[PDB]
Every structure is written in C-alpha cells, then in structure tokens.
Amino acid sequence: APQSITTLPLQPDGENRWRLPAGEYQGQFTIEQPMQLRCEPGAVIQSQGQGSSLLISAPDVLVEGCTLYEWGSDLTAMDSAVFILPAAERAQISNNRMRGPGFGVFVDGTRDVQVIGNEIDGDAGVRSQDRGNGIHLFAVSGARVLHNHVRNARDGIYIDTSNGNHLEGNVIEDVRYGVHYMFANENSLIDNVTRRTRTGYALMQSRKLTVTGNRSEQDQNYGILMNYITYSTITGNFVSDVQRGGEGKALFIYNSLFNTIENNHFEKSSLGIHLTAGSEDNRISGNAFVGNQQQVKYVASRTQEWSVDGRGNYWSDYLGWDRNNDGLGDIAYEPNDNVDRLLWLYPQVRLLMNSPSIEVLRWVQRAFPVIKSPGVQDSHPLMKLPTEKLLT
C-alpha cells in the first residue's frame, strides 16, 4: 500500500496544494498529511482490485477531480474507494469519478465531511448483496453530502447512526435501496432524485428528521418506507409509479407515531399509502393522491381524521362538489368501504370481488351508515391540485 507522495504531483501552489498529471497509477494510496490535491482528467488512479484505494487519515484534505477505478470487494475489511478515518475531520471529496465493486465513499467517526458532486457507478454482475454501499456514512455528526450521482451500488446512500447531516440534490439510480437510514436522529435530506429502485427511501428507526422535496421515479414495490420514525417531517415529496415486484406502495408508514406529512404527491402506483394499525394519529394533510388504483390501505375500525386545521388532501376519485367557493370540498371522503377491508382481512373474497352482491354491499354502505366501520376519512378534502410545482 503506497502513499500519495509516492506518486508524481506537480504543485500549482505551495500551500500543500498538489496536482496529479494525466497518466495511470497503480495500487492503494494513503493521505497522511493535509494536502489539498487536485487532479487532471486523465488521472486514472486504478488499483488492482484489492484494498481501499484512497485511505485518508489527515484533517482538512481537498481531494478534487480524481478518477478511481477497480478497488477491492471485502466488505468486512471495508474495501472502499475513499476511506476516511475518524482523525480525518472536515474532508472534502469534490467532483470525482469512481467505478468499483465495493464501498464508494466509506467514512466513519468523521466530522464535517463534505462529499460533493461525485459520480459513483457501482457494479453490474453482483447480486446486490455484495456490491457495497454508494456513500456509506457511519456515525458522523456534521456531514454534507451534495449533488452526487450514485449508480448501481448496494443500498445507495447508507446512513448509520449519523446525527446531523444534509443530503441535497443527489441522483440515485438502479440500486436496491435509494437512501437507507439507520438510527439517524435529527437528519435532513432535500431534493434527491431516485430512479428504478427496489425501495426509494428507507426510513428506519430515525427520529426528528426532515424529508423534503425528494423525487422517486418508477421505483419498485416501496416508494418511501418509514419504520419507527417519530417527530419527522415529510413535505413536498413526489412519488411516482411504484410498480410491483410488494404490490407497489407509494408510501408505507409502519409504526411511525408523530410526523407531519404535507404537500406530497403519490402518483400512479398500485397503493397510494399504506397505513398500518400501529401508526396512528399523525398530521396527514395537503397531499395529492392522484391516479392510484387504491388510495389508502387502513385495516382497522378506529376512526382516523386526515385533515389538520380544516384542510385535507386532494383525492383524484373524490366525486364531490363545492358550493361555497373555497378550496375545500363540502362532503367528507371515505377512501375505504367495509367491503374494501374484507378483501384485506380475508383473501378468499378475491374470487367474489366482481359479484353483484358485492356491488350491492358497496351501495348499502352509502345508504345505511350504521354498517359503516369507522375508517380513514377526511373532512374537507381539496378540490384542486396543491402540488402544482412538483410535476416539473
């Protein structure tokens, strides 16, 4: 494992700033001194397929413009492309191209690291169980990962026990998980774009975090999966066309107690939102449930008001009117019948689902409200689309 001083860097400026010329290199490399190294676009630092290619142990390092290729794959020994030690505080990894079968950017124990503008193409043949993480962050406080381009890794931007950090504007394509969150209290992520992913956003056991403006285009079976998130905030997300592969849920709220879910857009999936029985009484108001074949799945008999401050959500199948010309509808909207939960409670009713007697039972509930189980209604639904900006 050689070092970065064992290469041939021509210094542009004598403030520990270096510039690697065009030409290939070989093997792992190690930064031990605070060097603000740049690279020419022909700086193909190609390792041989083993070890972490650019290990970093020194603070205040501006690695910029490098192009790393073909590092190791031992995920237990953390074969990364850019390994950043706990002593390497405030590292900047700016505008880099990476292609290799392990971790792209593995940091751990670091503070105020900035991972900006990189393009990390992961793999093609490994079974998405040993591809390694795109941007792995392991218990970092202060991180700033912005405007990257992660493609074909395993579970995208993994986040483990990292407290305060932003994920702004990065594109994540063809992975199993888009963004994975594990115990990340007081996190934040803005404007990320996810395409063709087996779960667009994993929100697991992380409290107090802000999920805003993110996009999920044509993901598989789970648009945004939230497990055990409390006091969070889900504002302005655009989840589109979650196809099956699960049957396809644009938002799957599982055991999330308190969180504000406003201004979202759940579009053209099989299930618009899945609300489990344990996750109840949270502020869900102002979303847009358009084009989904079934809007809410809520298997309970507990009533669930879905409109805070008298404003509810826009529903595409809302066959209502508005007499006094405000934005709100006049009649309440129940998204689920009693027969829409007999199909979920007993799957053998799927054979009987086209029967006229079932179609009688849909009309008997609209005529006789004693048999209506208390569902997932919202008084005052919206009449127009509130997310007129999210379609762009």
Binding site: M204, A277, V299
Partner: protein, 143 residues
C-alpha cells in the same frame, strides 16, 4: 406443513423492512404460514406484524430464537422455540435490528437473569401489545 421452522439463509430479506436478516444481532422471529414462510429482521418487527389485524385471524405458527441457548451476536438456526410460550425481556440496552430489543427465552429464569442485569422486566407473549412496542422503542432509541 406448518410444523417446520425453516432455517435462515444469507439471502433472506425481512417481510417488513426488506433488508438482509443475517447482518444483525439479536433473535430473529419468523412466521410459518403453510402456504409460504415469511421471516423477520427482529422479533419486535415480527410482533409489530403480528398485532396488525390482517394477521390476528391468520392461523400461522410463530417461531423465535432461544437466546438462553445461543450467543447474542450470531444466533444459530437450530433451537428455535415457539413464540407463544416464550419469555421476552424488554427495555434492555442490547442492540436489536429494528424495534426494541426483545430477547426471547424459554425458561423464565435465564430471562430473569438478563432483566436484573440490564434493568428490564420479563413479560409473556400475550402481554405484548402495540402500546408497549412503541413505548419500549422510545425508551431505547430516544432522548
């Protein structure tokens, strides 16, 4: 066909969170349905799944690990007790996969060993409810 707790593979995803089960410590529940076995990344994620009303009426046997006869970081498939007759401890500082840490036992005295060793309380299977799972996870991963 409901009589067989199947063994875990490395390529075994959870039913709820969907992630890889054998990358985690703690006991891992699973549910044999006799039409298809579905597995869980933690016992608290199985008990969160069991208390949903689609699965209250569903006739399926629940199997968890025996942490009285296994090491807590890498549990073998092996001895896998019935989850209705177990003794879950709660409120310990142990790091489970998803929910609160619910170490499952079968003999109630080894369950009483870990309860006093971490400040927890033993409780049976029927005492588990969704008011308790969300309360215990807030005491573990909160504040």
């Amino acid at each position: 066909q409901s009589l067989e707790p199947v063994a875990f593979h490395d390529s075994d995803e959870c039913h709820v969170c969907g992630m890889i089960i054998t990358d985690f410590p703690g006991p891992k529940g699973q549910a044999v349905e006799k039409r298809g076995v579905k597995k869980f990344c933690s016992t608290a994620e199985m008990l969160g799944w069991w208390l949903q009303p689609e699965n209250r009426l569903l006739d399926a046997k629940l199997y968890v690990h025996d942490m009285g006869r296994s090491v807590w970081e890498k549990p073998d498939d092996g001895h896998l007790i019935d989850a209705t007759s177990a003794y879950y401890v709660v409120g310990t500082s142990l790091k489970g996969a998803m929910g609160a840490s619910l170490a499952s036992f079968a003999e109630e005295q080894d369950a009483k060993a870990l309860a006093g060793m971490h400040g927890g309380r033993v409780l049976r299977f029927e005492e588990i409810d969704q008011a308790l799972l969300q309360e215990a996870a807030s005491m573990q991963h909160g504040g």
